Structures are given as structure tokens and as C-alpha cells.
Amino acid sequence: PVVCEVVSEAIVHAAQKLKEYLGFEYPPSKLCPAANTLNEIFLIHFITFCQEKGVDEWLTTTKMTKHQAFLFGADWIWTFWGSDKQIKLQLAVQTLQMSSPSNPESRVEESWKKSRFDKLEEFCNLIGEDCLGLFIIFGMPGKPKDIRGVVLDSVKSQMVRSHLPGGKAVAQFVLETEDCVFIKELLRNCLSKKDGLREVGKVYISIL
Amino acid sequence: NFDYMFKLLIIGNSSVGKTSFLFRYADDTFTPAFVSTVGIDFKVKTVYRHEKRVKLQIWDTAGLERYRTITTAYYRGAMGFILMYDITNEESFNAVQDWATQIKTYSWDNAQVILVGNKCDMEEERVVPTEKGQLLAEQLGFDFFEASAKENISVRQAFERLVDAICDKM
Ligand SMILES: Nc1nc2c(ncn2[C@@H]2O[C@H](COP(=O)(O)OP(=O)(O)OP(=O)(O)O)[C@@H](O)[C@H]2O)c(=O)[nH]1
Ligand SMILES: [Mg+2]
């Protein structure tokens, strides 16, 4: 399954390119780059890596619009197509900045007061079994240039012990956890045996 | 602000022209590239009907069965539906009855429905005659339009008819 190895290399490449911009603050201000800017930089490097390797035929990167990002609790979606022309996997990726601590609402006027965590969980429930939520943390408290990953199911499992809200649960999970699984070790279950993911256990996903 | 707000949804098989329909109505533009909708999206358009300001929250649903669950959750609170088939594609017209019962199952909030056969600029590739669409719409109790998002035919008329139907039921 070539797509797994090439996409893992793409993820590590994009994160390493993004590390340059992490830990930057404007000269007088405490302001960092916008979350959308970081997400777009990461996505552009990732997609340019998937091109020149010829794997875009089996992988589609869809950046959520502002409306889609607000509704789905996802910042983009990776759809993995199989040997046939059928969808085999979907990763709903939400990014976080934990170097500094709110979701801005759209012009909806009909209701929607949930967290990004609950929205992502509901999105992945609605899509189906082969859709998994994935948090990517750009920078942690200390080590502002550290990029990590956490599967949503791991946080959900930790929530049966912590009994605290999902965002604080992801925050507690990115700390408190030293065991790591490499990104290529993950995603080896791309087009088969979706039980390997969602059963990754108490572990974070390391990029570099 | 505004005087009314109506939730409209656009449903139908994939590659039928739901996004193209929405983009033509909202931005008066068209692009031939096929970017399939992931789950759902929406756009807001303000119109003036019956000397009243009506805002339209128009949701573009995905046509693939894979999203049929998530899309259905957003039928909640919908007041109007654009059920679209493609006159080029017979499978899309055969799927209409299933879409209509899906409307009935998941909203049925006295939601008005409009049946639309898109791509009517593609007369050389038509496989569903106009009479078939008229008959099915008359049976189901829907108003009917053949339209083209490419050439901007009967797009505004379809949306305005939906808005008129919603306004009258009050
Ligand atoms: N000739 C012609 N082509 C059209 C028309 N409307 C859409 N198309 C083309 O048909 C294809 C379907 O476009 P979409 O609007 O994205 O189809 P869709 O209903 O949104 O499909 P999903 O997003 O998967 O649900 C695109 O390649 C368009 O360029 C039309 O009125 N006439
Ligand atoms: Mg679409």
C-alpha cells in the first residue's frame, strides 16, 4: 500500500516546513500567525508533496470552507480511494494551537453552540465507520515548534476516566502522555482493517 | 436586517448540478470544473418578494450515498427543497421518487418541493423527455422546471417559485 508511506512522508514534510513559522510573534504584539494561515501553509506543502509523487489519483485533500469548518468541526478532510474507484478512508483533521488559547460564528440565524470537539465527533458519527477524527497540535505550552497528532478515539477513551469536556480532554491528552506512535506506523491500515485505527489506545502520534 | 428567513435545501444525485445551480443563482457565474461537495455547504442570498425582504439560507447537499446520512441531519428546519435530476442522466430521474420520500421521511414540515431537470442546454444528450418530468411532478404534487445552470435558464424562476409556494402557505 504505497499511499500510506507517501502520505506519511508528506505529513512529516509539511510539518517540518511549517515549523519555521511556529513560534513567531509580531514585534510589539503577542499576536501569532492566524490559524488559517498555518493550516494553508501546511496543506500547500502537503499537496505539493503528494504531487511530484503521483498519489493524488488515490488521495483527495479537501479544505473546508469557513462554513464547513464551523459546521463540521474539521479544518480539512483527507479521503483515501482504493485500488477501485471507491472511498476507503476519510480523516477529518482539526488543528489546534496550544501555545496560546474561540470559534467565530458564521451568519447563521436559525442552535449551534457546541464545541469544535463535539461538532467533530458528530460529523464523524454521521459520516460513518470509515471516518476518523484527527487532531493535529501545532505547538504545545513550551516547545512552540512541536507538531503532534492525537486520534479522536483516544481522547474519547480517556474521557471515560477523566469525565471532563472534550477540548480540555484533548489538552490533557497531549500532555500527560509520553508514549508515541510514528505517523507511518499509523495509517498503515489505510485501505483495509479499519480496526487498527480507532483502537490505537493511549498514545499520541509523532510527526518528527 | 430582514423580514423573513427561509431554509432551502438542494438535493439530488451526484454530478447533477446542485452546486452549479446554487452558484449560478447566487453569483451569476458558472464553471465547468466538477468539484464534488463534501457533506454539505450553504450560501445566503437576500431577495425582495411581495414588497418584503426575504433572506434565503440555501444548503447545497452532497449527492453521494456516503453523505446521505449526514445530509439528512440537515433537513431539520428546512422549509423548501429543490429536488434535481439531470436530463442527460436517466439514473438521476429514476432516483427522484426515493429523494421525495426522503424529504417526506426526514423533514415533512409542510416543506414545499420543486422538481428541476438541470442541463437542459444539453438537448443533444437528453434521455428523460420533458413529459416524464411533468408527469412525475404532477403525480407527486410538485411544481416543475427544466433549467440550465450553464446558460442561466429557469434558475431564478425555480427559486422564486419555491419562495412563492412557501409564502402562500401562511
Ligand atoms: N452542460 C451543462 N453542464 C452542467 C450544468 N450544471 C452543471 N453542469 C456540469 O455538470 C457537473 C456537475 O456539477 P455539480 O454542480 O458540481 O454537481 P453536484 O450536484 O454539485 O454533485 P455533488 O456535489 O457530488 O453532489 C459539473 O461538471 C458541471 O460543470 C448545466 O446546466 N449544463
Ligand atoms: Mg456539489
Numbering used by the authors:
A (entry chain A): 18 to 118, 129 to 137, 139 to 236
B (entry chain B): 18 to 187
List sentences from the manuscript.
Detailed biochemical studies reveal that Rep15 is selective for Rab15, Rab3 paralogs and Rab34 and does not bind to other evolutionarily similar Rab GTPases.
To do this, we either mixed purified Rep15 and Rabs at 1:1 ratio or co-expressed and purified Rep15 ΔN1:Rab3AQ81L_19-217, Rep15 ΔN1:Rab3BQ81L_18-190 and Rep15 ΔN1:Rab34Q111L_1-237 complexes.
